Every structure is written in structure tokens, then in C-alpha cells.
Amino acid sequence: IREILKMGDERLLRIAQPVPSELLGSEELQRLIDDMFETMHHVGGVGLAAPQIGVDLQLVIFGFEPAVPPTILLNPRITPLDDEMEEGWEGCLSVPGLRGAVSRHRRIRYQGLDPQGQPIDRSVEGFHARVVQHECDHLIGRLYPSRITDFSKFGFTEVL
Ligand code: NI
């Protein structure tokens, strides 16, 4: 259980480094994965990225049992499948006390590596696409506030 970084911290603004191929398969990485799951599971979250616990790497976990399959995604790449967009709620463990409306692609393809280096290649929609988009925004130093276009829907959770 590592500490989750809060918005304002300059490390949630780095572009993350890719996972070097030597770490694929390794115990070192697997220790990282188990810490992330340990941390995300504890604060009740749906997703975590490596940057949010201090680690400069292109590595995200996500899962929910609008179900999303448990996944460890490395070195990700995203391709919107068409122009259609969709507004929904987003919160973030780095942005405590707050919620906002964001408009994300409805349909995406994502690609990357699993923890052993096997290729991942999926097309998804709806909440699944949202979560992947939100997570991969971390690996580029973007938090959901920098994506809001309707500030009428941005505010404190105990208010909204
Ligand atoms: Ni987040």
C-alpha cells in the first residue's frame, strides 16, 4: 500500500517512460503490479496508473466485477474508432472530493503488452473505453480537469 499522489504534484505531470523489455516477466515488475492492486483495492478504486504512486512507467491496472475485465496494460496505444463522443461522470483518486463530466470517445481500440510481453489488442465501448482513456491520460500528464468542457458539471461530491 503506497501513497497516492494528489493533483498539484509535478510527477502527475511527467510523461511516463515505457517499460523496458528486461522487466517483462520479472519478479521486479510483478512486485509493482501486486502493490498497485493492493493500493487500488484498499481505497476502493476502479483504476490506477503507475505515476499516481510515484512510479515513472507506462503501466496501468483496471477492473470492476457495467462490468470491466481485470487488466494489467503496459506501453499502451489508443486509436479512436470513430468521432462519436459521450459525456459521463469521472472521479479520480488523485482528485479527492470532486467529480466532473467529461466527454470521451465512445469507441476505441487499445493495444499494449501484458506483464509477460504477450500483445494485447482490443476494441471496446462505453464505460470500458472511458476507463482506459482516463487511465492512459495519466501516462501523459493529464488529469480529468484538463479534459472538462462543461464547467457547469464540475464540483464537490458532497455538493453534487
Ligand atoms: Ni485518475
PDB file of C-alpha atoms and ligand atoms in Angstrom:
ATOM      1  CA  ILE A   1       0.000   0.000   0.000  1.00  0.00           C
ATOM      2  CA  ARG A   2       1.847   3.025  -1.398  1.00  0.00           C
ATOM      3  CA  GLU A   3       0.678   6.654  -1.096  1.00  0.00           C
ATOM      4  CA  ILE A   4      -1.490   8.093  -3.883  1.00  0.00           C
ATOM      5  CA  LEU A   5      -0.275  11.401  -5.279  1.00  0.00           C
ATOM      6  CA  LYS A   6      -2.625  14.435  -5.266  1.00  0.00           C
ATOM      7  CA  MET A   7      -3.123  16.934  -8.133  1.00  0.00           C
ATOM      8  CA  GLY A   8      -0.516  19.715  -7.977  1.00  0.00           C
ATOM      9  CA  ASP A   9       2.365  17.280  -7.623  1.00  0.00           C
ATOM     10  CA  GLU A  10       4.784  17.673 -10.567  1.00  0.00           C
ATOM     11  CA  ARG A  11       5.095  13.821 -11.029  1.00  0.00           C
ATOM     12  CA  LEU A  12       1.412  13.530 -12.098  1.00  0.00           C
ATOM     13  CA  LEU A  13       2.563  15.885 -14.917  1.00  0.00           C
ATOM     14  CA  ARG A  14       5.503  13.808 -16.280  1.00  0.00           C
ATOM     15  CA  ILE A  15       5.111  11.876 -19.489  1.00  0.00           C
ATOM     16  CA  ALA A  16       5.856   8.341 -18.382  1.00  0.00           C
ATOM     17  CA  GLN A  17       8.589   6.078 -19.540  1.00  0.00           C
ATOM     18  CA  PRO A  18       7.946   2.828 -21.368  1.00  0.00           C
ATOM     19  CA  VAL A  19       8.524  -0.464 -19.646  1.00  0.00           C
ATOM     20  CA  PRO A  20      11.938  -1.730 -20.763  1.00  0.00           C
ATOM     21  CA  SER A  21      11.842  -5.290 -22.121  1.00  0.00           C
ATOM     22  CA  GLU A  22      14.218  -6.628 -19.418  1.00  0.00           C
ATOM     23  CA  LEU A  23      11.466  -6.114 -16.757  1.00  0.00           C
ATOM     24  CA  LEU A  24       8.878  -8.158 -18.704  1.00  0.00           C
ATOM     25  CA  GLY A  25       8.384 -11.459 -16.856  1.00  0.00           C
ATOM     26  CA  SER A  26      10.496 -10.331 -13.911  1.00  0.00           C
ATOM     27  CA  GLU A  27       9.743 -10.556 -10.233  1.00  0.00           C
ATOM     28  CA  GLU A  28      10.558  -6.766 -10.007  1.00  0.00           C
ATOM     29  CA  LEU A  29       7.512  -5.813 -12.172  1.00  0.00           C
ATOM     30  CA  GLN A  30       5.211  -8.370 -10.586  1.00  0.00           C
ATOM     31  CA  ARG A  31       6.025  -6.691  -7.208  1.00  0.00           C
ATOM     32  CA  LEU A  32       4.965  -3.419  -8.681  1.00  0.00           C
ATOM     33  CA  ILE A  33       1.717  -4.982 -10.015  1.00  0.00           C
ATOM     34  CA  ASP A  34       0.862  -6.508  -6.623  1.00  0.00           C
ATOM     35  CA  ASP A  35       1.453  -3.137  -4.894  1.00  0.00           C
ATOM     36  CA  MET A  36      -0.795  -1.358  -7.355  1.00  0.00           C
ATOM     37  CA  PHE A  37      -3.589  -3.892  -6.882  1.00  0.00           C
ATOM     38  CA  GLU A  38      -3.011  -3.797  -3.140  1.00  0.00           C
ATOM     39  CA  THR A  39      -3.291   0.042  -3.161  1.00  0.00           C
ATOM     40  CA  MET A  40      -6.250   0.350  -5.631  1.00  0.00           C
ATOM     41  CA  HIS A  41      -8.222  -2.381  -3.851  1.00  0.00           C
ATOM     42  CA  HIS A  42      -7.716  -0.598  -0.416  1.00  0.00           C
ATOM     43  CA  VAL A  43      -9.122   2.863  -1.392  1.00  0.00           C
ATOM     44  CA  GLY A  44     -11.933   1.143  -3.367  1.00  0.00           C
ATOM     45  CA  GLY A  45     -10.854   2.434  -6.778  1.00  0.00           C
ATOM     46  CA  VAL A  46     -11.688   1.199 -10.269  1.00  0.00           C
ATOM     47  CA  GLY A  47      -8.285   2.114 -11.778  1.00  0.00           C
ATOM     48  CA  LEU A  48      -4.728   3.123 -11.009  1.00  0.00           C
ATOM     49  CA  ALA A  49      -1.741   4.111 -13.099  1.00  0.00           C
ATOM     50  CA  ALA A  50       1.896   3.782 -12.079  1.00  0.00           C
ATOM     51  CA  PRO A  51       2.507   7.607 -11.939  1.00  0.00           C
ATOM     52  CA  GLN A  52      -0.087   8.055  -9.188  1.00  0.00           C
ATOM     53  CA  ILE A  53       2.008   6.002  -6.734  1.00  0.00           C
ATOM     54  CA  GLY A  54       5.273   7.717  -7.677  1.00  0.00           C
ATOM     55  CA  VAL A  55       6.407   5.338 -10.451  1.00  0.00           C
ATOM     56  CA  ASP A  56       7.501   6.785 -13.855  1.00  0.00           C
ATOM     57  CA  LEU A  57       6.169   3.871 -16.016  1.00  0.00           C
ATOM     58  CA  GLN A  58       3.647   3.131 -18.756  1.00  0.00           C
ATOM     59  CA  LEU A  59       1.656   0.705 -16.740  1.00  0.00           C
ATOM     60  CA  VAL A  60      -1.981   0.781 -15.668  1.00  0.00           C
ATOM     61  CA  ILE A  61      -4.345  -1.585 -13.952  1.00  0.00           C
ATOM     62  CA  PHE A  62      -8.143  -1.503 -14.068  1.00  0.00           C
ATOM     63  CA  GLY A  63     -11.138  -3.751 -13.256  1.00  0.00           C
ATOM     64  CA  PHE A  64     -14.677  -3.925 -11.822  1.00  0.00           C
ATOM     65  CA  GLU A  65     -16.748  -7.099 -11.154  1.00  0.00           C
ATOM     66  CA  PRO A  66     -21.303  -2.035 -16.301  1.00  0.00           C
ATOM     67  CA  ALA A  67     -18.504  -4.539 -15.637  1.00  0.00           C
ATOM     68  CA  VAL A  68     -14.845  -4.141 -16.794  1.00  0.00           C
ATOM     69  CA  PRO A  69     -12.492  -7.184 -17.047  1.00  0.00           C
ATOM     70  CA  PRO A  70      -9.413  -7.075 -14.710  1.00  0.00           C
ATOM     71  CA  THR A  71      -6.433  -5.989 -16.824  1.00  0.00           C
ATOM     72  CA  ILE A  72      -2.790  -5.027 -16.493  1.00  0.00           C
ATOM     73  CA  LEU A  73      -1.840  -2.955 -19.509  1.00  0.00           C
ATOM     74  CA  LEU A  74       1.656  -1.902 -20.482  1.00  0.00           C
ATOM     75  CA  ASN A  75       3.043   0.543 -23.051  1.00  0.00           C
ATOM     76  CA  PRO A  76      -0.435   1.360 -24.233  1.00  0.00           C
ATOM     77  CA  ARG A  77      -1.554   2.878 -27.530  1.00  0.00           C
ATOM     78  CA  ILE A  78      -5.102   4.173 -28.245  1.00  0.00           C
ATOM     79  CA  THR A  79      -6.975   4.713 -31.510  1.00  0.00           C
ATOM     80  CA  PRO A  80     -10.414   6.261 -31.516  1.00  0.00           C
ATOM     81  CA  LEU A  81     -12.662   4.082 -33.704  1.00  0.00           C
ATOM     82  CA  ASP A  82     -14.841   6.969 -34.869  1.00  0.00           C
ATOM     83  CA  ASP A  83     -15.607  10.628 -33.979  1.00  0.00           C
ATOM     84  CA  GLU A  84     -18.664   9.914 -31.779  1.00  0.00           C
ATOM     85  CA  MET A  85     -18.304  11.252 -28.182  1.00  0.00           C
ATOM     86  CA  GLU A  86     -20.121  10.626 -24.951  1.00  0.00           C
ATOM     87  CA  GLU A  87     -20.346  12.525 -21.667  1.00  0.00           C
ATOM     88  CA  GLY A  88     -20.210  10.724 -18.349  1.00  0.00           C
ATOM     89  CA  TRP A  89     -19.029  11.207 -14.764  1.00  0.00           C
ATOM     90  CA  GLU A  90     -15.393  10.703 -13.796  1.00  0.00           C
ATOM     91  CA  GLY A  91     -13.693  10.808 -10.398  1.00  0.00           C
ATOM     92  CA  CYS A  92     -10.055  10.179  -9.561  1.00  0.00           C
ATOM     93  CA  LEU A  93      -8.129   9.071  -6.536  1.00  0.00           C
ATOM     94  CA  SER A  94      -5.612  11.873  -7.222  1.00  0.00           C
ATOM     95  CA  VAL A  95      -8.540  14.411  -7.308  1.00  0.00           C
ATOM     96  CA  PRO A  96     -10.294  13.654  -3.956  1.00  0.00           C
ATOM     97  CA  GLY A  97     -13.648  15.222  -3.040  1.00  0.00           C
ATOM     98  CA  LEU A  98     -14.552  16.103  -6.660  1.00  0.00           C
ATOM     99  CA  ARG A  99     -16.421  14.760  -9.734  1.00  0.00           C
ATOM    100  CA  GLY A 100     -16.778  16.091 -13.243  1.00  0.00           C
ATOM    101  CA  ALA A 101     -18.451  15.483 -16.569  1.00  0.00           C
ATOM    102  CA  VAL A 102     -16.016  14.519 -19.330  1.00  0.00           C
ATOM    103  CA  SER A 103     -16.632  13.697 -22.969  1.00  0.00           C
ATOM    104  CA  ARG A 104     -14.551  10.788 -24.218  1.00  0.00           C
ATOM    105  CA  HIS A 105     -14.630   8.644 -27.386  1.00  0.00           C
ATOM    106  CA  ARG A 106     -17.405   6.076 -27.338  1.00  0.00           C
ATOM    107  CA  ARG A 107     -15.366   3.523 -29.313  1.00  0.00           C
ATOM    108  CA  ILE A 108     -11.685   2.841 -29.076  1.00  0.00           C
ATOM    109  CA  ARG A 109      -9.125   0.248 -29.959  1.00  0.00           C
ATOM    110  CA  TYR A 110      -6.260  -0.255 -27.456  1.00  0.00           C
ATOM    111  CA  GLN A 111      -3.014  -2.072 -27.782  1.00  0.00           C
ATOM    112  CA  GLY A 112      -0.100  -2.797 -25.488  1.00  0.00           C
ATOM    113  CA  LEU A 113       1.674  -5.625 -23.653  1.00  0.00           C
ATOM    114  CA  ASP A 114       0.597  -7.887 -20.754  1.00  0.00           C
ATOM    115  CA  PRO A 115       3.052  -8.476 -17.833  1.00  0.00           C
ATOM    116  CA  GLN A 116       4.870 -11.268 -19.772  1.00  0.00           C
ATOM    117  CA  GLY A 117       5.127  -9.341 -23.081  1.00  0.00           C
ATOM    118  CA  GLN A 118       2.170 -11.016 -24.916  1.00  0.00           C
ATOM    119  CA  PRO A 119       0.394  -8.495 -27.254  1.00  0.00           C
ATOM    120  CA  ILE A 120      -2.960  -7.035 -26.247  1.00  0.00           C
ATOM    121  CA  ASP A 121      -5.333  -5.726 -28.933  1.00  0.00           C
ATOM    122  CA  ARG A 122      -8.995  -4.991 -28.024  1.00  0.00           C
ATOM    123  CA  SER A 123     -11.863  -2.848 -29.377  1.00  0.00           C
ATOM    124  CA  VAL A 124     -14.319  -1.676 -26.722  1.00  0.00           C
ATOM    125  CA  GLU A 125     -17.031   0.818 -25.974  1.00  0.00           C
ATOM    126  CA  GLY A 126     -18.946   2.524 -23.221  1.00  0.00           C
ATOM    127  CA  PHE A 127     -17.631   2.559 -19.700  1.00  0.00           C
ATOM    128  CA  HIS A 128     -14.730   0.220 -20.682  1.00  0.00           C
ATOM    129  CA  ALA A 129     -13.469   2.796 -23.249  1.00  0.00           C
ATOM    130  CA  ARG A 130     -13.853   5.602 -20.702  1.00  0.00           C
ATOM    131  CA  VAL A 131     -11.683   3.891 -18.091  1.00  0.00           C
ATOM    132  CA  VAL A 132      -8.924   3.005 -20.494  1.00  0.00           C
ATOM    133  CA  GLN A 133      -8.928   6.652 -21.829  1.00  0.00           C
ATOM    134  CA  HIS A 134      -8.868   8.065 -18.304  1.00  0.00           C
ATOM    135  CA  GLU A 135      -6.022   5.745 -17.251  1.00  0.00           C
ATOM    136  CA  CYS A 136      -3.824   6.359 -20.277  1.00  0.00           C
ATOM    137  CA  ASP A 137      -4.307  10.130 -19.721  1.00  0.00           C
ATOM    138  CA  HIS A 138      -2.096   9.675 -16.550  1.00  0.00           C
ATOM    139  CA  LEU A 139       0.765   8.254 -18.580  1.00  0.00           C
ATOM    140  CA  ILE A 140       0.775  11.624 -20.463  1.00  0.00           C
ATOM    141  CA  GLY A 141       0.371  14.004 -17.513  1.00  0.00           C
ATOM    142  CA  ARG A 142      -3.335  14.756 -17.946  1.00  0.00           C
ATOM    143  CA  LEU A 143      -5.975  14.618 -15.284  1.00  0.00           C
ATOM    144  CA  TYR A 144      -9.712  14.758 -15.942  1.00  0.00           C
ATOM    145  CA  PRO A 145      -9.976  18.531 -15.039  1.00  0.00           C
ATOM    146  CA  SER A 146      -7.842  19.307 -18.133  1.00  0.00           C
ATOM    147  CA  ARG A 147     -10.491  17.487 -20.258  1.00  0.00           C
ATOM    148  CA  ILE A 148     -13.720  19.130 -18.981  1.00  0.00           C
ATOM    149  CA  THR A 149     -15.568  21.331 -21.465  1.00  0.00           C
ATOM    150  CA  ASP A 150     -18.770  21.862 -19.387  1.00  0.00           C
ATOM    151  CA  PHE A 151     -17.747  23.525 -16.121  1.00  0.00           C
ATOM    152  CA  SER A 152     -21.416  23.523 -15.035  1.00  0.00           C
ATOM    153  CA  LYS A 153     -20.921  19.853 -14.147  1.00  0.00           C
ATOM    154  CA  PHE A 154     -17.660  20.265 -12.179  1.00  0.00           C
ATOM    155  CA  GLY A 155     -17.810  20.315  -8.385  1.00  0.00           C
ATOM    156  CA  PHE A 156     -17.524  18.807  -4.920  1.00  0.00           C
ATOM    157  CA  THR A 157     -19.025  15.359  -4.449  1.00  0.00           C
ATOM    158  CA  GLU A 158     -20.896  16.167  -1.193  1.00  0.00           C
ATOM    159  CA  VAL A 159     -22.491  19.076  -3.125  1.00  0.00           C
ATOM    160  CA  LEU A 160     -23.413  17.307  -6.465  1.00  0.00           C
TER     161      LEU A 160
HETATM  162 NI    NI B   1      -7.300   9.069 -12.070  1.00  0.00          NI
END
